[PDB]
Every structure is written in C-alpha cells, then in structure tokens.
Amino acid sequence: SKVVYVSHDGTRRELDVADGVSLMQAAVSNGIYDIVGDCGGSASCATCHVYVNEAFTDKVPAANEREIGMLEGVTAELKPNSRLCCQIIMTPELDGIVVDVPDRQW
C-alpha cells in the first residue's frame, strides 16, 4: 500500500508498505533518514514525528495516551496534525497516505 513521505525540502518519496508495518519501520528501513525512530517504536522518544496530511488525519486510529505524552516533547513545531509515525500502522485503507516530515527529530 502506498505511503508518501514528503521531506521538509519538498521531495516526495513513495514507498509500498506491507499490512501491519508502522510508517516508522518502513521509513527507517528504507533510508528515510529524516525519521529517526530512536526508541524503536514504543512511543518513548518523539523522534518519528510527522505531520499527517489533512485528507488522512481522521483516517488513522487516534493517538493513545502514551503518544500524547511523548508528542509534547517534539523538537520541531507541534501542530494539530502532528503524530508519532511508529503509531501509524499501514492498512490497505490507508493507501496513498501522505505525511510531511519535519526538518528535525532531535
């Protein structure tokens, strides 16, 4: 299923991501270096911060309490569409989801 990662400079990278893989796992394993994923995906670090495109923000499962506690500490601007992408699990229904990657994670 297609996921489009748009870097801060505007370059769009479309990856095909298998069911059940987090957007963070697909990013880090494919050289999307602007997503760090330091804690390994347990919503313990805030370094997989992305901005979910408005056409998909309400299409993905809501942020649980742990993700909310960690989003508080993102280093780039926190926005209404900020999410930790290790919390976004790919499904066929999300095909085409676009996320914009901030210019910093640390």
Ligand code: FES
């Ligand atoms: S990889 Fe650590 S919060 Fe997402």
